[PDB]
Structure 1
């Protein structure tokens, strides 16, 4: 038969369509799912990425410092206690509950929740509480937002079903199955804002299963914002999530110090056998070298990060960047390759902090050609003349022509007018646009300095500055020629 179109790349998973409510003949016929081989969880790729080294690589003194500062809990004790007490009471009373946690990035939400469920699993290993199943659902790690329905049911039953069948199965399992035939499930919903669809059915279902009497379900919902339910969710879901919500504040600088010095307990103020032939250092031709990080360097890093964000990732990356700068300076002076006392002091931390804060924008427009800077200068002149923050391109063409023909006594303009309008030939006729007109316009568009409107008339098309006018004039004043006229 003749097809109107073809779908030759369809890849369909092997997932059944029959839900759990039809799996048994009656409610009384459902067995103990805890005593089932495939229920409640009762790494095939990790050998793929291995090879032989055939080399002994050099690990300098700063390498152990840089590995100790990677993201891969002295300051989270009240939040740990609250989350642990709520989850513990819900587990050992066979209750269903929702624990809401919100915060800015890198303040330790995921780490605290994972340590809470680790200590809960340790409690259930010694029979202080009934045994439970732990499930992680990250909303940013799903292809489709409905795949969470597929994931949780697969973690509960071992079945592979499609998403509507999975959510029917989960609805039947939480609602109708008796408690004595079930197990407690703790579900971490990480990145909750990613699980928000147009119709909020996933959020309603996940928080409404926690209001079922038989469910034995605990949902730990981790969100960006305290008032995410009030901003983006319905009143029923906001009622079901609750009024009691746990805020993870940004870290103060004493806590960022505590985190960094907890990362630097075993190598800060310690000795190394350095082997100055290669620089490969071994922790206790060969010298005993003390390594230290300055406490005031950690102080200024922690103070800057705690004022700006309180992010632990940012503080660890700042200290790691400082160690990288010190290691680059160290390997420059010896030529150690990769195959006394060395200190990560204040200035490395300051150079690491300022390299994220210095702007390349003014440096970028400084090193442009004459024609691009002439474009920017004419656009600034038109912006101050007619007061508009949006200028027609034909006006910019006429302004460039006017600035060339008015400042015709300038020596640079005398030297460059023939280049700008004839490419210095006297065989090319006089042009209506300058040489490299479309080039510098497209260059300022790729850089994001300019915005242009989608019109096909070139003269009446408008152009806007996407950067600050003060930055543009500061760039234009650095040039010797354009600051004169």
Structure 2
């Protein structure tokens, strides 16, 4: 058979098609799923990434501060912890089904406190105060396809691998018809729910609908970045019909961020260290004893700057880590140390680490361009000063460049550079319609994002706009000693 096209790289998973409604003859024929070694979960790739080191690492006194300010390593989230914990505990002890929607901006401690509530629930179930439950964590931004959540959750429930539609019918039949005495309670963390709802609202409506079933024994914790995601993905009738718990996560204040930072630094500040003077390795208590500190006002202004802009813990922790890294860079450069009295992280280190975030490189990039690129930007600024359109044709820029060269003939620099600009300093080269490196600087300003150019194959009538603002361009061209006097 002669084919019209070929698909030669099809890789298909060995996933079955038959849903759970056909695994048994009747609803009364289903055994105890808790007493089954494939149900409810009743990582071999670590040794791939393993090797042996030859030389010992020199662990500098600041590397403790850097390692201990990582996001991988619950002050201020007590009402949220209490609310999620009492909703989940009350629904678990009553063998009911509930759903808690948690919203907020990134980095405010949403996933962390939901996980801490879940571990506290697991510890209480270890003391047999509440019945046992399965914990499933489903992240919408960790998927190839949004329907794979259906494949994931059922695989955590039954242990078998199905396709997503059959998994959806299996989960529907599990939460609807399977009796409560033959099943276990399930707590689902639906993180990044906006990643799974972009195409359509099937996953949102299915997961919220399963908690309305009397047989479900299902706890769904759904975490998102906007508050009106259920109100705009489902109607108000549906959201009134489910009745989810609604919890917002406001950004941290500066005092809360400060307590977070020095609770990360509780055992390290104002502490002693035995430091090897020839290598720089430090051991927490030929050897010098060095005290280490971070000042209070540095953390204070860092947490004050973060709480004004974003209020998230990740930025505050990362500027503290960057300040410690800057201090350790200067320390290692001063003492000549390698990789294999009082040491302080100062206010100026936090200032510099914040200034790398605060400042922009647009003006600095534009002041170090060539004369032709600055000529292009100056001609563009002259054109938007004259006709006031904010989009200029490229031919108008060419004519404005030609006019600026022709007018300033008495200037020493323009007289010295015009032969370069229109003949590349050579008498065998004819006078060109464009300047030398015209398309080079046009492509460079388009690649940098300074410019925007429309898609048009006529090079004269094609339009170009500044993609930054007019004031950084004015500040850049007034820095140049050539452009600012003409």
Aligning the two structures, in what range does the TM-score lie when normalised by the shorter sequence? Answer: over 0.9
User: How far 1:238 moved relative to its partner?
Assistant: 3.3
Deviation at 1:225, TM superposition (A): 1.3
SS at the partner of 2:222?
Answer: strand
Relative distance call for 1:236 and 1:170 in structure 2 (3 A) is: farther
* Gaps in structure 1 of 5+ consecutive residues: none
Match of 1:197 in 2: 198
TM-score (norm 1): 0.99
Deviations 1:178-217 (A, max 9, x none): 1111111010000010011333111111111111111111
Change (3 A) 1:454 1:237: farther
Give the secondary structure class of the aligned counterpart of 1:287.
strand
Q: Cα distance, 1:330 vs. partner? A: 0.5
- 2:460 is paired with a residue of what secondary structure? coil
Relative to structure 1, the CA distance from residue 173 to residue 46 in structure 2 (aligned partners, 3 Å threshold; closer, same or farther) is: same
Does the aligned pair in 1 maintain the 2:186–2:219 contact within 8 Å? yes
**TM-fit CA distance, 1:4:** 1.2
Deviation (angstroms), 1:57:
1.3
Aligned equivalents of 2:245, 2:170: Cα separation in 1 = 30
How far residue 236 of structure 1 moved from its aligned partner, in angstroms, is: 4.8
Contact 1:68 1:264 in 2 (8 A): yes
Shift of 1:156: 0.3
Q: Distance in 2 between matches of 1:215 and 1:465?
A: 58
CA distance in 2, matches of 1:161, 1:354: 52
> Secondary structure of 1:338's match?
coil
**Partners of 2:242 and 2:478 in 1: how far apart?**
57
> Where do 1:441-460 residues align within 5 Å?
441-460=442-461
TM-score by length of 2: 0.98
Point out where structure 2 has 5 or more consecutive residues left out of the alignment.
none
Per-residue displacement from partner, 1:381-433 (whole Å, max 9, x unpaired)?
A: 11111110101001100110011111111111100111000001010000000
Equivalent pairs, count: 485
Query: Aligned-pair distance for 1:230?
Result: 2.7
Deviates more, 1:3-12 or 1:450-459: 3-12
Q: CA deviation at 1:243?
A: 6.3
| 1:249-288 CA-partner distances (Å, limit 9, x unpaired) | 1111111111111111111110001011100111112100
Deviations 1:443-465 (A, max 9, x none): 00000000000110000100011
Structure 1 residue 314 displacement after superposition: 0.5
**Deviation of residue 241 (structure 1)?**
5.5
Structure 2 distance, partners of 1:135, 1:348, is: 42
Structure 1 residue ranges, 4+ long, deviating more than 3 angstroms after superposition: 231-244
Higher alpha-carbon deviation: 178-187 or 232-241: 232-241
Structure 1 residue 31 displacement after superposition = 0.9
Structure 1 position 240, deviation (Å): 4.8
Counterparts of 1:197 and 1:225, CA distance in 2: 13
Q: Aligned residue for 1:378? A: 379
- Name the stretch that deviates more: 448-457 or 234-243: 234-243
CA distance in 1, matches of 2:300, 2:397: 51
**8 Å contact from structure 2 (residues 69, 321) kept in 1:** yes
**In structure 2, how many angstroms separate the alpha carbons of the residues matched to 1:329 and 1:304?**
24
**Shift, 1:135, TM fit:** 0.4
- Would the aligned equivalents of 1:207 and 1:237 in 2 still touch at CA under 8 Å? no
1:382 touches 1:391 (CA, 8 Å); kept in 2? yes
2:429 is paired with a residue whose SS is coil
